[PDB]
A paper describes a structure:
Here we present the structure of the sucrose–proton symporter, Arabidopsis thaliana SUC1, in an outward open conformation at 2.7 Å resolution, together with molecular dynamics simulations and biochemical characterization. In the asymmetrical unit, SUC1 forms a non-physiological inverted dimer, with both monomers in the same conformation (root mean square deviation (r.m.s.d.) of Cɑ atoms = 0.1 Å). Overall, SUC1 adopts the canonical MFS transporter fold with twelve transmembrane helices arranged into two pseudosymmetrical halves consisting of two six-helix domains, the N-terminal domain (N domain, M1–M6) and C-terminal domain (C domain, M7–M12). Extracellularly, a short helical region (named extracellular helical region (EHR)), which also has clear amphipathic properties, is present in the loop connection between M5 and M6. The EHR is anchored to the side of the N domain by a disulfide bridge between the strictly conserved residues Cys216 and Cys220. The structure captures SUC1 in an outward open conformation with a conserved electrostatic network between the N and C domains at the cytosolic side. A large and clearly defined V-shaped cavity, which spans approximately two thirds of the membrane plane between the N and C domain, is open to the extracellular side. Overall, the cavity is electronegative, but it becomes electropositive towards the enclosing bottom. Despite the presence of sucrose during crystallization, no defined density for sucrose binding can be observed in the cavity. In the transmembrane domains of SUC1, the only acidic residue is Asp152(M4), which is strictly conserved in SUCs and therefore the prime candidate as the proton donor/acceptor residue during symport. Asp152 is exposed to the cavity solvent without any close contacts to other residues.
Author numbering: 25 to 500
Write the structure that this text describes.
Amino acid sequence: DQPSPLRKIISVASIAAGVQFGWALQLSLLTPYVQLLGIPHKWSSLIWLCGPVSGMIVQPIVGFHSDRCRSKFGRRRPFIATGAALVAVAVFLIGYAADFGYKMGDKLEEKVKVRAIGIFALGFWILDVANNTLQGPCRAFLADLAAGDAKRTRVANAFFSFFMAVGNVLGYAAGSYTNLHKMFPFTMTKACDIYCANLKTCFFLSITLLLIVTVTSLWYVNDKQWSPPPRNADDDEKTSSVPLFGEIFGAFKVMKRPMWMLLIVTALNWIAWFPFLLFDTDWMGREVFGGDSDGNERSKKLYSLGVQSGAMGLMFNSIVLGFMSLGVEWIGRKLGGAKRLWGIVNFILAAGLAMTVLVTKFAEDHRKTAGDLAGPSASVKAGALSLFAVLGIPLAITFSTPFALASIFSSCSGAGQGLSLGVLNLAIVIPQMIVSLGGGPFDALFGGGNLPAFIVAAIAAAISGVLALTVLPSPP
């Protein structure tokens, strides 16, 4: 009960930059790679869905096992190290899938390159398992360093979100820079495109940054070897359970009122966020710029242009995220509580999701005066990018406050940090599958386009604000 200094908590929070780099990398390089491999869109949907499913499975099991690690290296360091090593292996397998597939039998003038697709899928599965092995114990290790100090936990998670934004900016700048392959001239082969070579170079830089921020962090911070308390032969803790739902249901039944209310507020928060976070680039390429991936060559060109402009919007968003993360705790304190700031920024999210309709109206008006395939004006561009920028404020709270509150409640109750966070992750990965599988049908139900999902998400965000301000209990 005597906290490790801030220097070590921030050293542990700094690994989020190296983790987020490897994902932000892929925004403008994964789609051309999927085109190059020729993966059928149904198989692509399955590969993508493997993400949230693996988040459902790995997170609680890893949390429950990390809370009982008993290793000499600590409760959290072994899992983080294993996750980073598996990230390295997954990078190696994803970047080189096309070249192996070619050298193993794939034909150059054949659309569906089978062997390359198999290697690609194995790589992403390893990466999913690695990410879900890493995420839990790292924030749990922050919670261990805080040793019951609520303010220290809040500061730790604010810095975690800050480093996430740092890694996002770095990966967005690398992934969108053509001619990066000039670093390694032999990245381009007969089966590897220029974007493939940029992907390889970005993955090299990813392994580099990850080693840099991880080795130093795990040598620099000591992880305290855990000792289990003595037990009888007739105890539940030395008794086997259901393989996967054992940890989840055990978490749910030792649970408190505050944890239930926090999970509800977080689930509604992510049901609000994921429509935009999943369909924003399509909204930009379709509603805002005009054009479809199908149709005449200009409309395909305009769709590509809209997607690029959306990537720039996300860049602005991450910059704003990083700047807000540094003031989260002070602003929350002066407002009289972190959940107060949560509730307040959720209404900003609601209004921002509402502004989408006005942007779309301005774009159709310009398209009527200047032509259907004339593209947007500078005003429509500026407005869409301003929306992307402003939305960075609530995302900073979403990336910090819920995990900190989970940790504080689990410290008061004694639940266990790793498994509390692994169960909190359900309120993120279940809305993800709901939105990804029901967005299209829901939009079609209400006329088409992207906007109905955005209006329902705005209402959900306002409801999240109300509940965070009223039903969510304050910490002790």
